[PDB]
Structure formats: C-alpha cells, structure tokens
Amino acid sequence: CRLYGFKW
Amino acid sequence: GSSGPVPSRARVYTDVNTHRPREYWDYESHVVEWGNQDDYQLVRKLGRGKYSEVFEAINITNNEKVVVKILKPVKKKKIKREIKILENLRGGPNIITLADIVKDPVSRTPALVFEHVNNTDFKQLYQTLTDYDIRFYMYEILKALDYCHSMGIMHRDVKPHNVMIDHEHRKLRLIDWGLAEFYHPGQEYNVRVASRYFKGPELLVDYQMYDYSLDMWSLGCMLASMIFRKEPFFHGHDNYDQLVRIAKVLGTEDLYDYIDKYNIELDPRFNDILGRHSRKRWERFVHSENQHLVSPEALDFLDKLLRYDHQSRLTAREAMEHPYFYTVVK
Ligand SMILES: Nc1ncnc2c1ncn2[C@@H]1O[C@H](COP(=O)(O)OP(=O)(O)O)[C@@H](O)[C@H]1O
Ligand SMILES: [Mg+2]
Ligand SMILES: [Mg+2]
C-alpha cells in the first residue's frame, strides 16, 4: 500500500 | 511618476539581504540533493490544503516520528523558495526544522520532511489558554518573527494553522514557509498572499511595496481572536468585505489617511460598500466570558499592532519590549 511513492 | 503609489521601506532590517552573498536570497539558483523517499512510511494523515497533504510518518532508518509535507503541483521555483527559506532559518528560535527533501520516482511529487510537533487544534486549544498562556505563546511567536525578519524573510501567512503548539511542553513552532519571501527594499510583491482574515490592509488596497510589518497585522488578528474569544476576529466574506469588517472596528478616518499618505488607488468597487465608520473602542468586544484575558496592557498592545499604516505598527522586537510581556518568565 503506497501514496505518492510512500509505503503505509 | 505622479500616478505611481508612493514608495515604502521597512523601518527595520531594511538592507539585510543586500549585504548577504547572492546565494542566500537567490533561491532560483538553489540545487536540491534528494534524500531517500524509502526512509519514510506514512502512519496517519494530519492536514490537507490546495498546496499540500501532510502526514505523520516514521523514519524507518532511526524509528523517529516525522512529518511529511507532500507538495501539490506548483512551479519548481516556489518549491526552491520554501526549501531555501527553511534552510536559511533552520536552528532559529521557534522555527520548524526541515529534516529531508524527497521525491516520488513515479509521479515526481516532491515532499518536505520536518520535525514532528504534537499540535493541539487551535479550535480546541485557544479557548483553554490562561491570560499568562496567551502572553507566553505570543512572546514565542514574536521570537520566530523577529528572527525571520532579522534574516530578511517575511512569513506572509501568519495564522493559527501555521503555528504548531505542543502544549504539554509549552513548545511553539512557526511552520508553513511556502508563501514566505525575501525582503528587498523597493521590491513590489504579490498582494494575493496570507489568508483572507489575516490579510493586512496593504494587501486589501493592493499596495505592493510592503514588508515584514505585514506579519505584525496578522499577529494582531491572532491576538484579537484569542483575548476576545472571537475566531476569526475580522470575518470578511471576500477581500473587499474583509476591509469593510476592519473599517467597521478601526474606523475609516485612519484608512483614508493611509490611502492618501501612499497615494493608493482604492478599487472603485469599495465606493459603495465602505462609506465612513467611527473608530470603535477595543472595549466593545470585552464580555463576562473573555474579561479575564483582557487588560489595559493587552488592548494597548493590540492597538499598536492593528494599525492601517504598516510603518506605524510595532515591529516584532518592539512588540517584545511591550508591557504586556513583562510577566512572561524569560
Ligand atoms: N511539523 C508539523 N507537525 C505537525 N503538524 C504539522 C507540521 N507541519 C504541518 N503540520 C500540519 O499540516 C498542516 C499543513 O502544513 P503547512 O506547512 O501549513 O502546509 P500548507 O502550506 O499547505 O498550508 C498544518 O496546518 C498543520 O496542521
Ligand atoms: Mg499552512
Ligand atoms: Mg502554506
């Protein structure tokens, strides 16, 4: 799970 | 020529950027050395705006809690300006610490990594503050503003959401330097800055040759909202109504005197909404629920911040010398 490249 | 607005210079820290090396203020020349985006994993959402989404994150290299400011698309130029200002001001009193700069390899979305502050939403915190607590935190904001002004930087977005307070620790950090700019004497700036309720009269009457004193109008708006428990204090429905809301309290005599001093052309759509207003006494806002926050020293300080004439306002250091702060243990 990822947002703008960052892992949760 | 005869139709120009009259020029203005900051009363203080006027030439500080002139005498710096060019690389200090020339943010367009700044080069970013990107960190490793994989260092940071998002834990929780903290805030979202037209310009950013902000998360609590973990630095997996050291198990440190950080904040990641994911920047919405804007000119590269504006990203370098926020970074350069944060690097210039890093380590100063009550200035948020920039820790790292990273980018999504896929989307190319850049992100600022900051020191985490354990904030309490102003809409919960401010109504709990004692008279002492308000003076204490106002003094902490002034340390940041005198610092950034002394460093040739105007914040241009002073407001509660840009002031992080870890109340457990009485720790304050001035954040959000994305609209901040370098003060150069004679430079004409964009008036579309700050947030409506905190915009100084210079921005509302479209006077471009403004300076650090803009931040002191914003700070006055914060102080008024706080001591009178009325948030926001000047609640305009638009930039034009904003000046009417101000003029209904400070009166129009000093406003027209301001407009005349600087030969400001009043947008003629003010012609039908402004009129003439009496100057009200700061005492009309005092009531049973806020009287414990109000003192002659508080009203005197507020009166010296909320002046139409940017040159007449207290500077951050002059504010620090005001009797309102004599009781703050330093
Ligand atoms: N270091 C931080 N610690 C805690 N919360 C933060 C921090 N930085 C930003 N925030 C939160 O995220 C919001 C948006 O960050 P900010 O830098 O003000 O972005 P913008 O320029 O989009 O307004 C802030 O109003 C605050 O609620
Ligand atoms: Mg902000
Ligand atoms: Mg901002």
Author numbering:
A (entry chain D): 205 to 212
B (entry chain A): 0 to 329
Question: What is written in the article reporting this PDB entry?
Answer:
pmcCK2 is a ubiquitous and constitutively active protein kinase. It has a heterotetrameric quaternary structure, consisting of two catalytic subunits (α or α′) and two regulatory subunits (β).2 The α/α′ subunits carry out the phosphorylation of target proteins and peptide substrates, whereas the β subunits confer stability to the enzyme, control substrate specificity, and govern cellular localisation of the holoenzyme complex. CK2 acts as an anti-apoptotic protein and is seen to be overexpressed in a wide variety of cancerous tumours. One such alternative method is via the inhibition of the protein–protein interaction (PPI) between the α and β subunits of CK2; the PPI interface is not as well conserved among other kinases as the ATP active site hence its inhibition is considered a more selective approach.
Additionally, we considered keeping the Trp residue and stapling with Cys and homoCys (hC) residues using the linear sequences CRLYGKW (P7) and (hC)RLYGKW (P8) respectively with mild oxidative cyclisation conditions. P5C4, P5C5, P5C7 and P7C8 all showed reasonable activity, with IC50 values between 15.6 and 54.6 μM. Combination of the X-ray structures and IC50 values suggest that the homocysteine-cyclised peptide, P8C9, retains the binding conformation of the peptide more effectively than the cysteine-cyclised peptide, likely due to the flexibility provided by the extra carbon atom on the amino acid side chain (ESI†).
